Amino acid sequence: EDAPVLSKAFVDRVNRLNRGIWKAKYDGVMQNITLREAKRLNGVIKILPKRRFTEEEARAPLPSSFDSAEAWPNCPTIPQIADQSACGSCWAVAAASAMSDRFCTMGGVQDVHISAGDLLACCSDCGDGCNGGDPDRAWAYFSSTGLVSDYCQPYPFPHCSHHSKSKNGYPPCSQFNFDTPKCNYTCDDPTIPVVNYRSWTSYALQGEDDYMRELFFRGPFEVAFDVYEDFIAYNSGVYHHVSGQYLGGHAVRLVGWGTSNGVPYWKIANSWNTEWGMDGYFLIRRGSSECGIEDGGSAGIPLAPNTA
Ligand SMILES: *[C@@H]1O[C@H](CO)[C@@H](O[C@@H]2O[C@H](CO)[C@@H](O[C@@H]3O[C@H](CO)[C@@H](O)[C@H](O)[C@@H]3O)[C@H](O)[C@H]2NC(C)=O)[C@H](O)[C@H]1NC(C)=O
Ligand SMILES: *[C@@H]1O[C@H](CO)[C@@H](O[C@@H]2O[C@H](CO)[C@@H](O)[C@H](O)[C@H]2NC(C)=O)[C@H](O)[C@H]1NC(C)=O
């Protein structure tokens, strides 16, 4: 359990087997991560109505590549990469990030960051905080209860690095194990007034076409996939699973699609900060539910604040 996940030999095997379609790297940022730690980063554990597309949506000829940041270039939350830190809160962090993106693509508010802290601590229905939770219930909680912004309640755990000498001066993740924070009802600075943000509807997505089409019209949303040990070593290219044991479910924010040398893929924002993968992003094979990635998405529509 305090054993390293990765070895040079494991990585060499992965890179033989993957045929150079993606690159695994041993002495990357995850070189020394242990099994206990790697498992804690995957915090998906465990219903919404299915999305229905109108006749118009359904007949759109979707382009052969698409990137949310290019399609909504005035929405500054889209390209930001989060850091869930030493806590299994991806389910909440990928939800909050996408909710912030959607306030801009749909909800008329250019730059509000939805608080993943509030959701993590207060949505007890959703799961068990830092020990993991359920993406779908997170979206349902955004409708029924609503969430404050991170200006009100900032994410309570600092960035941490799996490198021993972090490029960004982040402290080591191993020196931390965090437990679910207490749910609060005022902002950290109590003189900042509580502003509550809410969606009016939530829904589930399934399959390559649903996903593409939802992304095209409405923008980023949250998906989950199975994490194997070879994923830990990902450095670049279009991932697909070739070796390693199952490490758990992980939620992430889907932001784009394309094709690279004949391989269709999804572009995805991870939440392990910008030191990991391709500046915080990874590509993964699209079209064949690689590691279950197309088995269920969760999304919703933010309600615009105030009135006209
Ligand atoms: C709700 O408010 C509570 C109470 O203020 C927030 O709890 C506080 O969270 C911070 C950040 O983790 C904790 O800081 C730690 O303090 C310990 C002991 O002083 C120190 O050794 C650490 O280095 C770190 O500074 C603080 O202890 C903690 N307070 C309590 C009572 O647990 C909480 O995070 C807020 N909830 C949300 C969702 O943000
Ligand atoms: C993983 O752990 C090994 C060994 O601790 C790291 O290697 C040490 O790195 C520090 C700083 O780079 C050096 O001063 C030591 O000489 C190294 N020790 C040995 C035995 O190699 C390695 O840097 C760690 N890798 C990462 C990415 O954090």
Side-chain angles (χ1 to χ4, degrees):
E1 206 78 343
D2 309 304
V5 167
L6 296 184
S7 64
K8 190 196 168 171
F10 175 68
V11 163
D12 289 324
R13 168 196 188 101
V14 166
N15 282 331
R16 171 171 47 93
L17 289 179
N18 70 26
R19 314 179 231 268
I21 293 174
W22 63 274
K23 295 180 184 170
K25 158 168 232 285
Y26 173 57
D27 66 325
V29 90
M30 298 293 225
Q31 194 179 7
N32 299 323
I33 189 172
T34 63
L35 213 239
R36 187 181 80 274
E37 290 169 290
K39 286 206 229 226
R40 242 230 160 178
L41 291 181
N42 305 315
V44 170
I45 272 142
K46 143 171 273 317
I47 222 155
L48 313 163
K50 197 197 189 211
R51 166 74 139 114
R52 305 287 205 41
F53 296 96
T54 72
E55 293 216 354
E56 296 71 13
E57 292 178 298
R59 56 165 295 108
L62 299 170
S64 59
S65 76
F66 178 84
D67 189 78
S68 289
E70 288 179 7
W72 295 281
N74 301 131
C75 289
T77 65
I78 297 161
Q80 296 172 334
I81 292 300
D83 188 350
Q84 71 192 78
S85 197
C87 166
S89 53
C90 54
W91 61 275
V93 164
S97 289
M99 294 162 184
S100 317
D101 294 347
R102 288 192 173 223
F103 256 104
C104 188
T105 63
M106 301 186 84
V109 181
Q110 173 178 41
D111 182 29
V112 65
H113 293 77
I114 295 299
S115 180
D118 184 15
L119 172 58
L120 181 57
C122 305
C123 185
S124 55
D125 207 307
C126 285
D128 188 31
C130 283
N131 304 311
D134 178 346
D136 293 340
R137 303 245 185 198
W139 290 83
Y141 186 80
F142 183 49
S143 289
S144 56
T145 298
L147 293 170
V148 303
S149 66
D150 83 345
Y151 179 59
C152 187
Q153 293 178 20
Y155 189 64
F157 307 130
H159 282 48
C160 69
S161 182
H162 295 285
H163 215 288
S164 54
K165 161 191 198 180
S166 157
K167 289 217 170 150
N168 301 120
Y170 300 152
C173 302
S174 43
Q175 93 179 47
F176 306 122
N177 180 54
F178 296 123
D179 302 314
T180 308
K182 172 200 186 280
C183 177
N184 306 318
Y185 310 100
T186 63
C187 308
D188 275 20
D189 181 339
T191 70
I192 291 177
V194 175
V195 181
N196 182 72
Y197 296 89
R198 225 160 42 229
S199 56
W200 64 276
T201 196
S202 306
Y203 51 76
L205 288 313
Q206 179 164 176
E208 179 192 7
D209 191 73
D210 269 17
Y211 274 27
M212 287 166 79
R213 219 145 213 108
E214 175 63 13
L215 195 63
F216 184 78
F217 282 95
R218 300 200 170 156
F221 63 90
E222 175 163 26
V223 299
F225 71 109
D226 299 327
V227 178
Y228 295 90
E229 301 169 303
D230 59 355
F231 188 78
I232 295 311
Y234 175 87
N235 177 268
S236 58
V238 182
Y239 170 84
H240 65 290
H241 179 232
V242 295
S243 327
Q245 50 167 344
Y246 175 81
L247 299 172
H250 186 37
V252 280
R253 179 164 51 106
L254 169 66
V255 306
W257 77 76
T259 291
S260 166
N261 312 309
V263 183
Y265 67 81
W266 293 116
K267 187 191 174 186
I268 289 161
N270 203 350
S271 57
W272 299 345
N273 78 60
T274 55
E275 289 177 354
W276 178 93
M278 304 178 83
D279 295 315
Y281 293 92
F282 65 104
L283 317 177
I284 179 158
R285 184 152 71 189
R286 160 172 60 99
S288 42
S289 211
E290 185 64 31
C291 296
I293 200 150
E294 294 151 9
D295 298 355
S298 323
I301 303 177
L303 206 61
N306 277 334
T307 87

